[PDB]
Symmetry: C2
Subunit: 682 residues, 2 copies
C-alpha cells in the first residue's frame, strides 16, 4: 500500500456522512518512513563516529561541539533519540526531510533526523551550558518550544545562512543615507532577506534641493531603487513604510494599482502605512487631511518627519506658516486604502498612537517589519561623504521563536518553559554580529531584543471544547498571555543579574520607573469564566498574583532587564506544520489545508486534535470572521510588548466598506497593527 501521497490525498475525501478518515494520514507517515526516509538515511556504527565523519567531511561545525565535553554531546544525542518523538502528520515529516534536515552534498541521502537537528540546535544555543542545552532539547522535543526556521535550519551546520533574518532600517533625507540603504538592502537580501525601510523622512515630490525651488522626485524613485536591489540579489524580500500624513501618500499607494504607469509601478516591494489617531477623527467628521512637508518640518524643528508626533502637533503644525501643507480627503484616503488592499492584500497598518502609547521604551516607533509584528524604537545614523559612518545609529533586527500553547498547558512548570525559550532566543541575539550593517549590529548589541511568540491557540481551544471567539476563549487568551508575560519579564530580569547589565536606555524606560506594572497592579486579572478558571487549575499553572507582580516590580526597578523587548507574535509558516500547531492564535484557514508542493502538486494537512467527533469545533477564519479574530488579538495586545501579525479573512463578496469597518473596529479595540487582507481563495 506504500504510496504515501495517495494516502495523504485520502484526507481530501468525505464519506456520505461528511466524515474524513484521518487514520489514512498516519498510514501515510508510516509508508513515508518505510519507503523513503529509512532507505535514504545514513546510519553510523555510533554517534562518536558520526560526529567524527560529519565534522571531517564538512557538514557539521566542530566549533559548536568544541564547547562541550564529547561525552556530554554523545549523551545528549542519545537522550534525544530516546524521547520517543513522532511526527504527527505526513506534511510535518515531509516538510522536515524535504527542506530542513541535512542531506549529503549531492542531495541523495539524509544525515539527520528530527532529534539530531534538535540536538545541534540545543548545543548551539546553549553555548557550553549543559543544563540549558538539555532543557532546550526537552522543550523542543516535547513540542513545547519551536524556534523560527532560520534558526532551526542552520544551527550546527558548517554551510549555514544567518540565524537572524528580519531587519528594519531607517533612511535619512540625504544621498548618503539613501546610498547606504540600497547597499544594506543588497547585503541583507543576499542572505535571508526580510528587510523593511522607513520612507517617512524623505522629502516630498516637489520639495527643494540645494536651494533650487522645485526638484525632488519624491519617494517613488527611491522605492524603484530598492525594488531593483532586492530583485538583483534574487530569496529575500522588502517592504517600505510611509506615514499617512506624508505628501506622497496617494502616489505611494498608487504604485500598487494594476492600471497605473510604468515608473509608478512597484511590483515586488510590500507597502505599509502608518496612520495616527486623528486621521481617523478627521474622516469621521468628513474633514480634509493635512499632509505636511517633511522638508519644512526638519528645518523648523530639527527633527525628521518620522521623529515627531503628528497627532500631538496636528494643530500646531497647521498653524505654522513655515510648514507647507497640502490637503486631501480623509475619507477618500481610507477609501483608496481599502481598494488597494482589496486587490493586493496590502497595505499593512501600523496604528502609531496605539503603539507609542503602549511602548514602554523611551523614544518613538515609526515603522514595522515585513510581517508587521516587530515594533521597536530606532535612531538615525550620520555618514561622511565617503559613506563612512560618522555616528552609528540604531536600527532593528530580531529573532523569533514561539511555543505551542497546548503543550505548554500540558506541563506544570511553565516558568521553566518560558525561561528556556527566552534564554535560547537571547543566545540568538548575543551570537548575532551583522557587520555589513553597523547600525543593525550596534542596535542588537544595545537592546538584545527578542521575539517570543505563541501558536496553536485555536488547536488548543478546540481540544478543550471552547469555540473560537467565545467569551471563554477571550478569557483564556487574556490570562494565558498575562502569565507568559510575567515569566518573561521575570526571566529577563534574572538575566540582567547574571550578566550584570541591562539593555541600553533601561534607565529612561518605563520599566525603570515602574509605570510598566501599574496595569498589573490594578485588577481586571481573574477569570471572567469558570471553565477557564479550571483549565489553569487542572494544569497546575498558577496565575500570577498581585504580590508576585509587586515583587517583580521591585526586582526589576533594582536589577533591571536584559532584553529591551520580549514578545512578538508573527505568523508561524512551515515550522508550524512540523510542530503540528494551528498557525498562531488565529483560527485555522481550513480543516484540511492544501499546499501546492511535491510530485503530486498537492499535500494535505489536518488540524491538531481534530477528529470526526469534533469537526464542529474547527470553523475556518472566513466563517469565524474578523470581529472574533480581532477580539482575540486584542486580549493579547494588552500584554505583548511588541506586536502581532493580524490578517483578516473576508468573503469574496466583501466590499471596501466591509474592510474599512473591520479596520475601524480594530483601531477602536487597541490593535497595534494589521497585516493582510486576505479575501477569499482560488
Amino acid at each position: 500500500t506504500m504510496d504515501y501521497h495517495a494516502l495523504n490525498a485520502m484526507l481530501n475525501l468525505y464519506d456520505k456522512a461528511g466524515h474524513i478518515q484521518f487514520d489514512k494520514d498516519q498510514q501515510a507517515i508510516d509508508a513515508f518512513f518505510a519507503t523513503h526516509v529509512r532507505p535514504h538515511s545514513v546510519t553510523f556504527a555510533s554517534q562518536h563516529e558520526r560526529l567524527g565523519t560529519l565534522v571531517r567531511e564538512g557538514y557539521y561545525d566542530d566549533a559548536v561541539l568544541a564547547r562541550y565535553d564529547r561525552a556530554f554531546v554523545l549523551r545528549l544525542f542519545e537522550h534525544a533519540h530516546a524521547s520517543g518523538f513522532r511526527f504527527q502528520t505526513f506534511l510535518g515529516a515531509w516538510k522536515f526531510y524535504t527542506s530542513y534536515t541535512l542531506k549529503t552534498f549531492d542531495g541523495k541521502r539524509y544525515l539527520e533526523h528530527f532529534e539530531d537537528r534538535v540536538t545541534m540546535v540545543a548545543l548551539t544555543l546553549a553555548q557550553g551550558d549543559e543544563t540549558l542545552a538539555t532543557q532546550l532539547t526537552d522543550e523542543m522535543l516535547s513540542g513545547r518550544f519551536q524556534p523560527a526556521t532560520p534558526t532551526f535550519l542552520n544551527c550546527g551546520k558548517q554551510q549555514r545562512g544567518e540565524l537572524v533574518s528580519c531587519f528594519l532600517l531607517r533612511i535619512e533625507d540625504n544621498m548618503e543615507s539613501i546610498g547606504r540603504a540600497v547597499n544594506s538592502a543588497l547585503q541583507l537580501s543576499k542572505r535571508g532577506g526580510g528587510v523593511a525601510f522607513l520612507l517617512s523622512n524623505l522629502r516630498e515630490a516637489g520639495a527643494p534641493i540645494k536651494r533650487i525651488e522645485n526638484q525632488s522626485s519624491g519617494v517613488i524613485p527611491v522605492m524603484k531603487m530598492l525594488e531593483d536591489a532586492f530583485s538583483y540579489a534574487n530569496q529575500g524580500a522588502g517592504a517600505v513604510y510611509l506615514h499617512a500624513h506624508h505628501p506622497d501618500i496617494l502616489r505611494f499607494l498608487d504604485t500598487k494599482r494594476e492600471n497605473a504607469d510604468e515608473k509608478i509601478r512597484i511590483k515586488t516591494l510590500s507597502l505599509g502605512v502608518v496612520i495616527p489617531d486623528i486621521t481617523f477623527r478627521l474622516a469621521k467628521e468628513n474633514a480634509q487631511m493635512a499632509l505636511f512637508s517633511p522638508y519644512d518640518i526638519q528645518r523648523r524643528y530639527g527633527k525628521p518627519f518620522g521623529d515627531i508626533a503628528i497627532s500631538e502637533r496636528y494643530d500646531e503644525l497647521i498653524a505654522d506658516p513655515h510648514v507647507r501643507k497640502t490637503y486631501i480627503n480623509a475619507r477618500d484616503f481610507f477609501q483608496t486604502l481599502a481598494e488597494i488592499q482589496f486587490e493586493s492584500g496590502y497595505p499593512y497598518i501600523m496604528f502609531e498612537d496605539t503603539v507609542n502609547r503602549a511602548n514602554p521604551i523611551a523614544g518613538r516607533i515609526n515603522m514595522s517589519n515585513l510581517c508587521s509584528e516587530i515594533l521597536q524604537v530606532n535612531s538615525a545614523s550620520r555618514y561622511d561623504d565617503n559613506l563612512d559612518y560618522t555616528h552609528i545609529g540604531h536600527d532593528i533586527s530580531c529573532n523569533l521563536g514561539s511555543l505551542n500553547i497546548a503543550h505548554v498547558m500540558d506541563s506544570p512548570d511553565i516558568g521553566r518553559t518560558v525561561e528556556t525559550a527566552i534564554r535560547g532566543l537571547t543566545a540568538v541575539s548575543d551570537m548575532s554580529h551583522i557587520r555589513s550593517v553597523p547600525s543593525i549590529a550596534a542596535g542588537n548589541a544595545a537592546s538584545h531584543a527578542i521575539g517570543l511568540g505563541q501558536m496553536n491557540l485555536h488547536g488548543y481551544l478546540a481540544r478543550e471544547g471552547i469555540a473560537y471567539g467565545s467569551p471563554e476563549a477571550l478569557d483564556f487568551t487574556n490570562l494565558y498571555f498575562y502569565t507568559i508575560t510575567w515569566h518573561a519579564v521575570h526571566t529577563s530580569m534574572r538575566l540582567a543579574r547574571e550578566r550584570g547589565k541591562t539593555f541600553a536606555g533601561f534607565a529612561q524606560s518605563r520599566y525603570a520607573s515602574g509605570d510598566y506594572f501599574t496595569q498589573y497592579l490594578q485588577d481586571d486579572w481573574q477569570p471572567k469564566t469558570a471553565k477557564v478558571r479550571a483549565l489553569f487549575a487542572r494544569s497546575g499553572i498558577t496565575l500570577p498574583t498581585r504580590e508576585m507582580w509587586l515583587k517583580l516590580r521591585d526586582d526589576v526597578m533594582r536589577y533591571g532587564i536584559y532584553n529591551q523587548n520580549l514578545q512578538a507574535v508573527p505568523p508561524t509558516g512551515s515550522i508550524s506544520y512540523i510542530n503540528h500547531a494551528t498557525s498562531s492564535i488565529h483560527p485555522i484557514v481550513a480543516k484540511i489545508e492544501i499546499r501546492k508542493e511535491g510530485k503530486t502538486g498537492r499535500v494535505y494537512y489536518p488540524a491538531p486534535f481534530m477528529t470526526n467527533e469534533n469537526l464542529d469545533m474547527y470553523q475556518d477564519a472566513y466563517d469565524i470572521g474578523p470581529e472574533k479574530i480581532i477580539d482575540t488579538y486584542a486580549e493579547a495586545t494588552r500584554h505583548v510588548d511588541q506586536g502581532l501579525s493580524l490578517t483578516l479573512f473576508f468573503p469574496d463578496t466583501a466590499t471596501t466598506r466591509d474592510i474599512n469597518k473591520a479596520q475601524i473596529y480594530a483601531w477602536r479595540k487597541g490593535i497595534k497593527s494589521l497585516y493582510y487582507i486576505r479575501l477569499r481563495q482560488l
Copy 2:
C-alpha cells in the same frame, strides 16, 4: 530693426544665387547687446566696489581673490576689458549670457561679461601666480585656449558645481563592489554626472555563487540598477562597457532593441563595447567566437576577465578545460552590432589591442568614458564587509580643455600657448578632491591626468583653402599634432622639475625607458606637401627636430613627467560656439547649424571664416564621408596619448554593411575608438 532673432534667422535664407547674407548675423549681435545685454547688465562705480559687492552678497568666492594682491586683481580685470574682445556670432553671445555668465540670484540682471568670467577663471587656475594668471587671461581672450564648460562655468563663483565632471569606474565581481558602484553613481551623478562603469569583470548569467551551480543573473540586473541610480539623482548620465568576448555580450546589446523585453531594457544608459583584434580575424574567416567565463578565469588566473589579454591568450584559453566557453558567430556579432548602432547610434567601440599597443603607461586599458575619448589605466579596490575600503584602488577622472587651432597658428609662440593650457588644466587636477569616491580621488592624486584637446581644424583648413580630407590636410594634421605633443611632454617634464615629483608609476612607464620617443627619432617627420611646409613657415612655428626630441628624451628620462596623460580630443559642445570654432578636428555638420533653443525655437550658427566666396570649402561631414574623416583622426591618433571622439556620419540610405565597412577601415587604420554612428537627420 532691434529683433535679434529674426536677424539671426536671416542666415537661413538663400538668394536666387544660393548665397547667404552673413552680415545679418553681426547685426543680430549688435541688436542683442543693445536691446538685451546692456539694459540688463549691472555696472558698478568701479571694479573695487564690484568685487566688494559680489563677495558680500554671496556671488563671488573671496577665497579665490584672497590669493592675490587686490591691486593685481583690479589690474587684471582692466587688462581684460581692454583686450577688445568681441563675440563673432549671435549664438556665441546668446549662449554665453543665457547659460554661462553669472546672473543675480533672482535671474534678472547680469553680473558678468566675457572678460570678467575669463578673469575669474584665470585667477582660480593660476592660484596665486600672477604671470600664469595673466597668461591664462591672454590665452583665453585671444581665443587660443578654451577650457571645458564645467570649468569655465564655475571658476570663481560662490555657488559652484565641481570642476571635474568625467569619471570612469571599475566594478569588481562581488556585492561590496557592486554596492559601491551604485553609490558612486549616486554621488557623482548628483553633481555633474558623466560616469562610466566597466562590467567586464562581472560573472556571466548562469555562473555559480557560493558553490550553488546555476545562479547569476548576469550584468543586466546590475545595469538596471545603475540606470535607476542615474535616473533618481535626475543632470548626470551613465555608460557601461562590456568586453566583446564576454558571455553576456549578446544580451547586453539586446537591451538597446526597441522590440525586446521589459527587464532587458535599458533606455538611458549608454553602451560601449571593447573588441580585441582577433574577433576581427575570426569574423574575417567566418569562424566562431569563443566567449570565456569571467568566473572561471578569475579562479584559474587570479585576475579578473578585464585584466587579462584575451587576444594574447585566445588559444591558451580555449585549450584550458577549466574555463567554460560558450560560442557565437563572429560575423553575426558584427552584424547585430551594426544593427543596434544603426537604430540608436551606439555602441561605442574601444579597440583594445590598438589602445594597449599605444599605451605608454604600465598596465592595461579596459574601458572608456561616456564620450569614448578617455583612455587610461585603472586598478581594483577592495572593500570590507561594512563597505569600508580595505585597499583603495585607482579609478579615472579627467578635466578637459582644448585650443583653437587656427588662433594657435596665428601666433608664433606656440610653446607658451601649450605650456599655459597644460598648466591650467593641471591646476584643475591639483585642486580636485572628490572625497565621496576615494578611488577617484586617490587616482587623480597619483596620476594628475589631464586632457588637452583641439578644435577648429576644419575651420582652419577652410580658411587657408585646403579641402578637408585631402593630402595637404592629412599632412597638416599630422605635423600640427606632432608639434603640440612635443611642447606638452616638454611642459609636463618641466612641471616635474618644479614640483619635484612625477606621476605615480613613472618608473615602470615607457617614458622612463625612453621607448615612447623611438617613434619620433625615426623619420616620417617632414612635409609631404609644400603648402603645409609654408604654413608652419608663415606662422613662425618651428617643427620640432631630431635634436629637440633627443634632448627632451634625456630631460624626461632624468627628471620625469608630471602628468600620466596629456592629450585627448573630446567633442567640443557649446564652448565651441562661444569660441567660434568648428567642433573639433572633424568637418562641420552644416554650413548653417541649427539649434533648437530660445523663444524662436531655432537659432542659427554660421561656420568660422565662411563667406559667400568660399562656401565650396565648407562641405558637411555627410558629404565628406567617413573615409576622409577616419583618415584625419588617424594622423592624430599617432600622437594623442589618450584618444579622440570619432563619430561617423552616414546617409539615411546606408546599410549595416556600409557601417561595418567603415568600422573595419577604422580598425585597420589605427583608430583607438569610435563614438556614434550618426545616421542622417530629421
